[model samples]
Target: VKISHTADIQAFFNQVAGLDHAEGKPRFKQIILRVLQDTARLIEDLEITEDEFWHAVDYLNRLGGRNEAGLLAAGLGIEHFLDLLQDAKDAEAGLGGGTPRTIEGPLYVAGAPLAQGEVRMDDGTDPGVVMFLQGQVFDANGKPLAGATVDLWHANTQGTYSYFDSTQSEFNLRRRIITDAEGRYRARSIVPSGYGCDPQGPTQECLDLLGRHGQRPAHVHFFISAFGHRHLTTQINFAGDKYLWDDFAYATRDGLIGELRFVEDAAAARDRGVQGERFAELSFDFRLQGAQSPDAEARSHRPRALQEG
Candidate 1:
């Protein structure tokens, strides 16, 4: 019954792709040809059952219906692999040095409030431990770069974001800080909790079959951009989180671990203007390489929340 190697099957595939009459995009035709050929081969090699094939068809339906295609891509390491491929290409072009980029998970919302130097990110509703974060932006030559934009966002203490959670304030833990004269940006926020995928969702369903947990470590997301420099998309996973390295999204990378220091003394908290004796501190800097083109100074055009007017 395996007619994948038959001339009739070959002709059918070619006809399905309009190789006989339709004049579609050549590139699309090329890619579709490979997809059809490989799918047929897969059917032959794996002896995929008809029922199994239809089940997969419905699985894709649920996956898209949940709008979790991006999340599934991250869970499967495809997003991380894109970063690795870009890293290799940048290295080949002698565009190394600066921060090691990581996958920007499908959670970034655009148009956060812009500030200069410092901002308070939390809304005082969550009583999580106060986090005093400060960092500088530097050029590839190690010179502090003033006027760089440090656009950052993170989940709240409950491991939920603002727009998506519906219960949180608008842009609750999001801010865009322009570097000060000293190239420093600071924020007084709270420690965010790590989160896992929806247990009842399709992404988790896929992970369950793979015998893997869909969890990401407590982390922050950032997009750092400066004039005449290549834009950077990265995040910092907390130092001691259980899933720091085992992130289902694989967003963690070396040199991106945020080593947080907890200050337990009352005096230190008072000096930091916090109410309690326990506050966390984080200091992480970023570097940017010279941009070779205007496109290099901008992020990829992947659709994001509230990105359009």
Candidate 2:
């Protein structure tokens, strides 16, 4: 009997439905079944024209060919979506009182040098208004966490990261600062601007066709990891940024919006002087949970693309 498109897909799923293995095996049969059911339901409801389906395949091929898969994932908000799911799970497990997790983006490099107290994250360049980000790392009970590492990076005024854009020097806007005995740490850098995707890239082409602008809100990226704490990868957005609520990456969360405190006194500003127009201060606290093992800590630094693979 000739099978319709839907039946052909269902038949393919059926071949693996009843497959079995040893009791100790990590069987994925249930997962396969759920995926097949979900996909069949989706296909039954939505009709795809031959032109649109082939166009989608072509787009996927180009996304892989141009090394734009990471960019595409960020633009489509898949990374943020997954983070939200993880956050939900954490909440269900009663480990979700601290600042919510956000996408770490594709620019985090492992093994960044750690410094006690403070560092100049802007590499001694004047890109915009100089500002200080001060924060404490704490446990659930609110005790200070000395030696906790804060891995931080932000876009320059031009909205380009150092390693990703050849125009900037290495580690131009990236640094790691360890908390002092008081569990307090600070870093000085110019206020980061919103980053725009490359207009000519395939990812941008897709966004443009969908009537979307490829801009993330003005923010700073951070990955906080400490001994005996859950890994926290997140970002903080400047308040009042036009795109704060409408991020193209869908990265904005209720708890991630940072308050901007204007510093009018030069001496006060001098203490944290890093360069820009008007300086705004940002301070936040981080809380972490228990991790499974040291190997889990090592796995945290692995690139998301590699982890997915």
Candidate 3:
């Protein structure tokens, strides 16, 4: 019954991979062989029933249909695992000190409008509490880096992103702020709410089965890059968020807290042009390390939606 280890099955796998005659991608074939071997071993070790296997096959289709595959990946901590793996690689390579990297959730859209120094990220449609975010970019040597690109995006008060939420205006809560001569970037936006998995979705279904909740804290996602520094993909989870430390996606890290402060002074809100009696402020500085290669200066080639310029 343990055919995976048998010589016949071994030969059959090689044949399936066309190792007998076909010249294929050697790296892909190597990976495929391991995948096949490991999957077969898992089936044997877990005594997976035919019915359960068939159900899993069906579930994959449904997950794809709902476009929740990425969500499930984060919920299961696979995305975070990739970050940890990269961290280990960086450590081994003596790449030390800088803003820590974290998972870039699947909601990023490629072409948000760019601004100089500061920008108003919100479209003024949402009545959420005003948030003034400011940050500076610095090099590994602690020198302020000018002309850096700070692409930022966040969910709205309703826990929905603009491009994904049809009701909102284009690129709401999204902007690319170019750091000024002093390496400062700022944005005026509303306090974004935390979001949860669709209760009826496959991602939540999987989490339910695991006795876990698919909830993310109120956070802002960022992509920071300079001319010669390593590109950083990270986010700032608000300090007081209930799910800050218990993020379902495991994105919360020590240095990434937003350290939000809410001021209830009417005069302070008036000065910032905020109509509300209260407003929030967050200041987070980013540090980047020198890139070891040109490839490190750019973002990963993940499939993302792009708005034509």
Candidate 4:
């Protein structure tokens, strides 16, 4: 409603958001107001007029229509910047011996097949390099937790998720395994391939329109919960993938990139029943922070709207 000046529009922004609810709220409103003011300043400073401004709105409309509005933030490093901020807080709080926290992609879904020790993701029918990842769960002090539950999910051979990828079953390549008495756990899975957005997809259409072609590296996501520990959300990035260092999600973190080695065992893993001449192995130990509240104990696949973790 302001035809006059930048201050007038910013005044409206202040008026509207201040008038919103809850106290998660004031800072949130200021964030929006701040971005609007900064962007508007940039617009006017660059002498953007009616045609360009309206066109910019149309571009934003396309992005929101696709419901992938946050993709741009990750691709452009804002997500990584936020991660750096999280890490800074971690260090400030003296969190140590724990795997670094990372962002969860929007593809996560709860309720997978639960098992003890190890489980095979596919029925050995999918086409890809066979792999087995083994790991132990530990507290922040590096002591093994006896019976921790670790949930792992990843893409299929053709770079598609389970429930989202209609070609596969709902539980394909997703497992919820419990660590043994010694805190050891394992999973029989394929060498998960990296996934990318469809060239004509909204994610890529925006990327193409904006002239960026970044892809996420091959990764295995995890949600770990142990008694008296914080519910940890993290992932493992395959070492040496080209996109590992430069990902669309900006999610690569130290201590999270898994070391992979070709397994050349001849006897086969008789314990887990995975028999093959050549297999891949990843041995990792997860260290999680101490939980101070019940919210820290809840195991969830995706972040909730008003819930804090």
Q: Is candidate 3 or candidate 4 better by TM-score?
A: 3
Ranking of models by TM-score? 3, 1, 4, 2
* Model 1 residue 295 distance off true place after TM-score fit, in angstroms: 1.2
lDDT of 3 by residue, 208-308 (tens): 99999999999999999999889999998998899998999999999999889988875664466766568899999999999888998878888887833
Q: Which of 1 and 3 is ahead in lDDT?
A: 1
Instruction: Kindly give the number of clashing pairs for every candidate.
Output: 0, 3, 0, 0
lDDT of 1: 0.91
lDDT of 4 by residue, 266-306 (tens): 66668646665777888888888888888777855345322
Q: For residues 150-243, what per-residue lDDT tens digits would candidate 1 score against the true structure?
A: 9999999899988898999989999999999999999999999999999999999999999999999999999999999999999988999999
| Inter-residue clash pairs, candidate 2 | 128-276, 129-276, 130-275
Best candidate according to lDDT: 1
The parts of candidate 3 lying over 4 Å away from their true place are: 267-270, 307-309
TM-score of each: 0.95, 0.81, 0.96, 0.82
Displacement of residue 54 (Cα, Å) in model 2 is 2.2
Instruction: Give stretches of model 4 more than 4 Å off.
Output: 1-10, 18-35, 209-211, 264-272, 298-309
Model 4 clash pairs are none
Q: Report lDDT (Cα) of residue 257, candidate 3.
A: 92
The residue pairs in collision within model 1 are none
Ranking of all candidate structures by their lDDT, best first: 1, 3, 4, 2
